[PDB]
Write a structure and sequence with these properties.
The chain has helices spanning 43-55, 87-93, 110-122, and strands spanning 4-11, 16-21, 24-30, 33-34, 60-63, 76-82, 85-86, 98-99. It is α+β, with helices and mostly antiparallel strands. It binds thymidine-3',5'-diphosphate and calcium ion.
């Protein structure tokens, strides 16, 4: 897998973000994670977390997996990196997202995220308290 440049357009919530990719605006949905909707418990905290992470980054990168790059809603499906730190992984680590939507084509970083989830559960963080 390889990392591609991209620029913040707008934070949306815990696991979606509007980015410019190859000069085009696009909504990206984070692979392998599920944050609560904003109207749910830890929803605002998740939105806030992803927001600080992408807004404070000097460099945002997009990294597609091996399968699907676009979902049925036309959202890009990717691992997003903020100055070298994976947002997907950081949300899980903090117990602000659960590992989810693990599909056969796009699961490269699955073990790494379940590792972070076990560790966040161990600490009873946010979702897991
Ligand atoms: C994370 C992810 C979600 N999706 C689809 C499945 C879900 O369909 P349904 O809407 O039919 O339940 C939806 C959930 O996304 P949200 O969690 O952002 O709503 O997005 C994918 O197709 N691929 C993916 O990698
Ligand atoms: Ca969600």
């Amino acid at each position: 897998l390889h990392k591609e440049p991209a620029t913040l357009i707008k934070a949306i919530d815990g696991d979606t973000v509007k980015l410019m990719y190859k000069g085009q605006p696009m909504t990206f949905r984070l692979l392998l994670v599920d944050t609560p909707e904003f109207n749910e418990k830890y929803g605002p905290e998740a939105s806030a977390f992803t927001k600080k992470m992408v807004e404070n980054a000097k460099k945002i990168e997009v990294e597609f997996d091996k399968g699907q790059r676009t979902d049925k809603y036309g959202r890009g499906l990717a691992y997003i990196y903020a100055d070298g730190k994976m947002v997907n992984e950081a949300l899980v680590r903090q117990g602000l997202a659960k590992v989810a939507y693990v599909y056969k084509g796009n699961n490269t970083h699955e073990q790494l995220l379940r590792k972070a989830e076990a560790q966040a559960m161990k600490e009873k963080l946010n979702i897991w308290s």
